[PDB]
Every structure is written in C-alpha cells, then in structure tokens.
Design an enzyme around this catalytic site. Structure first.
Site, PDB file in Angstrom:
ATOM      1  N   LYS A  30      40.293  37.125  33.195  1.00 18.85           N
ATOM      2  CA  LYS A  30      39.230  35.764  33.223  1.00 18.85           C
ATOM      3  C   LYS A  30      38.854  35.373  34.590  1.00 18.85           C
ATOM      4  O   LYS A  30      39.924  35.344  35.350  1.00 18.85           O
ATOM      5  CB  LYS A  30      40.311  34.907  32.304  1.00 18.85           C
ATOM      6  N   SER A  54      40.861  41.468  29.379  1.00 15.29           N
ATOM      7  CA  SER A  54      42.302  41.357  30.067  1.00 15.29           C
ATOM      8  C   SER A  54      42.088  40.448  31.396  1.00 15.29           C
ATOM      9  O   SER A  54      43.090  39.853  31.665  1.00 15.29           O
ATOM     10  CB  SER A  54      42.958  42.353  30.392  1.00 15.29           C
ATOM     11  OG  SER A  54      42.324  43.182  31.525  1.00 15.29           O
ATOM     12  N   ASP A  65      27.495  53.371  37.919  1.00 16.11           N
ATOM     13  CA  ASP A  65      27.222  52.671  36.676  1.00 16.11           C
ATOM     14  C   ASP A  65      26.689  51.323  36.963  1.00 16.11           C
ATOM     15  O   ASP A  65      27.122  50.285  36.825  1.00 16.11           O
ATOM     16  CB  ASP A  65      28.246  52.257  35.833  1.00 16.11           C
ATOM     17  CG  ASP A  65      28.216  51.720  34.415  1.00 16.11           C
ATOM     18  OD1 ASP A  65      27.380  52.021  33.627  1.00 16.11           O
ATOM     19  OD2 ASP A  65      28.528  50.459  34.600  1.00 16.11           O
ATOM     20  N   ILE A 110      34.129  31.008  33.877  1.00 17.86           N
ATOM     21  CA  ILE A 110      32.669  31.629  34.365  1.00 17.86           C
ATOM     22  C   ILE A 110      32.852  33.075  33.288  1.00 17.86           C
ATOM     23  O   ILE A 110      31.885  32.862  32.474  1.00 17.86           O
ATOM     24  CB  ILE A 110      32.750  32.245  35.765  1.00 17.86           C
ATOM     25  CG1 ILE A 110      32.525  31.035  36.621  1.00 17.86           C
ATOM     26  CG2 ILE A 110      31.614  33.302  36.013  1.00 17.86           C
ATOM     27  CD1 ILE A 110      32.667  31.188  38.206  1.00 17.86           C
TER      28      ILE A 110
HETATM   29  C1  LIG Z   1      32.934  37.753  39.019  1.00 24.29           C
HETATM   30  C2  LIG Z   1      32.109  37.015  38.776  1.00 24.29           C
HETATM   31  C3  LIG Z   1      31.309  36.167  39.164  1.00 24.29           C
HETATM   32  C4  LIG Z   1      31.682  35.596  40.409  1.00 24.29           C
HETATM   33  C5  LIG Z   1      33.115  36.367  41.007  1.00 24.29           C
HETATM   34  N1  LIG Z   1      33.496  37.376  40.424  1.00 24.29           N
HETATM   35  C6  LIG Z   1      31.318  34.564  41.072  1.00 24.29           C
HETATM   36  N2  LIG Z   1      30.267  33.586  40.475  1.00 24.29           N
HETATM   37  C7  LIG Z   1      30.005  34.207  39.264  1.00 24.29           C
HETATM   38  S1  LIG Z   1      28.412  33.362  38.528  1.00 24.29           S
HETATM   39  C8  LIG Z   1      28.525  34.288  37.218  1.00 24.29           C
HETATM   40  C9  LIG Z   1      29.649  35.444  37.504  1.00 24.29           C
HETATM   41  C10 LIG Z   1      30.061  35.404  38.343  1.00 24.29           C
END
Ligand SMILES: c1cc2c(cn1)cnc1sccc12
Length: 253
Positions: free
Chosen positions: A23, A21, A132, A16
């Site tokens: 992912k 640091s 923020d 995604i």
């Molecule tokens: C961080 C970012 C996301 C998430 C959970 N934690 C779940 N779905 C998506 S779709 C685009 C960013 C994210």
C-alpha cells in the site's frame, strides 16, 4: 491517520496505490513536507520474495547517488513483519498521465524520452536489466520522469512492451525494445501491437518478422528512425542505449 517510520512521524493524507500486499500512501512529516510511504506486508512472504525485496531496496538505495532520474528514497524501516519506505512523492505515473491526455507535446515527449534513457542507462551500468518496462514504472515529478523500480522485487502482465527474446522462452537490448514501445505509444497513440486483441495472436506477431511493424510518416523524421532502431527484432541488430543518448532526436534542437 498516522504512522512512525524510524524516529519520524508521518500523517497519512491519501492512499496513492496498492500493489496487493503493498500500500503506497501520500504523507506529511513533523516539518510538514509531503512524501510517499510504501507499506509492504511480510506476513506471507517466502525467503526468495524476501530476498528479492532486500535486493531491490539496496539497489534503489545504491543508485540514489548516480541519477536524479531514479526515485529519491529518504529512509526505511524494515522488520520481520513489514517494510516502510519514505520516498519522494511524484505527481502521477506516466501510464495514467498518458491514458488521460489526448495530445502530447513533441518537446514534452523528447524531454521524457531523454529522462527514460538516463534512468535505464544507470541501472544498466550497475548490471541491472529491468526486463519489464511499461509507462507505469515511470513517475512524473516536476516535469521530470523517474524510474520507480528495477523489476527485481517479485498496470502489470501487459505483453505490449515485451521484447521478442523474452517471448522466445535477455540483455540490455531487451530494455531498448520496451523503451521504444513506450515512445511509439507517445508518438502513434498505441503500442506497436495494441491493434491485436488475442494475447496468443499478439505474441505470434512480436516474434513474426513477416508481420511488419508500421511507422506512419511524421514531421519528426528523427523520432521515426529512433522507433525503427528500438523496434528491430534481432537484439544483435537493435540500437544500444549509449547509441540512443547520441542520436540526433535526443541531441538536436
Ligand atoms: C510508488 C509510487 C508512487 C510514488 C512512490 N512509489 C510517488 N508518487 C507517486 S504518484 C503515483 C504513483 C506514485
């Protein structure tokens, strides 16, 4: 590829996002359900950064029970070397969704706004001031916006959503300034100060009362008043979130 968070095994489908640091991946469990796993590398982490991480997590875990507008956190594995978080998978962040679509439905927007107040209001009730806010912080999941983080753990850098008080160097009124900028972007197609390239000149404009923020006439006269209320430079003279949740824009059909 694959990974194990606690007992359960999660098959990696795609990546995604990457914070740096960190992912974030889209995964599948043994019951073949779709989730979002966050990997965090603690290898080069100070004990202050460690504490911000642990704080941000516990809060996200605590606030699960209060609002449905706060990203579901199903499970986590935490060692001295890494963090794994099993969260709900959303469709897209508000930023990428707004950046793509040319036309935004007044209802879709009014709905999204209501979801944005509920989220910020719940963190406020527990003492948190996000400080923020940006559309990047919100995630669409089944036409419903959800707050990703509380700005506790250590699009980013953008001063377009920054309240004047944050620049003058911080109360819930700071989050009201930012939320209004978000609405202004979904109303006028730009942030109030997006028009000015130079970041120093952009900063002077936010803190300048003589530099009038323009509110071009729209059919939604209520929506204009909300913007005018949220974008008031004096935090003392800015609308509160309980007040916004009772505004006609949000309450009236
Ligand atoms: C961080 C970012 C996301 C998430 C959970 N934690 C779940 N779905 C998506 S779709 C685009 C960013 C994210």
């Amino acid at each position: 590829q694959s990974m194990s968070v606690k007992g359960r095994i999660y098959s990696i489908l795609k990546q995604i996002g990457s914070g740096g640091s960190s992912k974030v991946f889209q995964v599948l469990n043994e019951k073949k359900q779709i989730y979002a796993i966050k990997y965090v590398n603690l290898e080069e982490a100070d004990n202050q950064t460690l504490d911000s991480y642990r704080n941000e997590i516990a809060y996200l875990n605590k606030l699960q029970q209060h609002s449905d507008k706060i990203i579901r956190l199903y499970d986590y594995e935490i060692t001295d070397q890494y963090i794994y978080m099993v969260m709900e998978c959303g469709n897209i962040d508000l930023n990428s969704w707004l950046k793509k679509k040319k036309s935004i439905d007044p209802w879709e927007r009014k709905s999204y706004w209501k979801n944005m107040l509920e989220a910020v209001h719940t963190i406020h009730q527990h003492g948190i001031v996000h400080s923020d806010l940006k559309p990047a912080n919100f995630l669409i999941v089944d036409g419903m916006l959800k707050l990703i983080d509380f700005g506790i753990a250590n699009q980013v850098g953008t001063v377009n959503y920054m309240p004047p008080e944050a620049i003058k160097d911080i109360s819930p009124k700071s989050d009201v300034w930012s939320l209004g900028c978000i609405l202004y972007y979904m109303t006028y197609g730009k942030t109030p100060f997006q028009q000015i390239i130079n970041q120093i000149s952009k900063l002077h404009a936010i803190i300048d009362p003589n530099h009038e923020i323009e509110f071009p006439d729209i059919p939604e006269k209520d929506l204009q008043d909300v913007l005018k209320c949220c974008l008031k430079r004096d935090p003392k003279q800015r609308i509160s979130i309980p007040e916004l949740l009772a505004h006609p824009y949000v309450q009236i059909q």
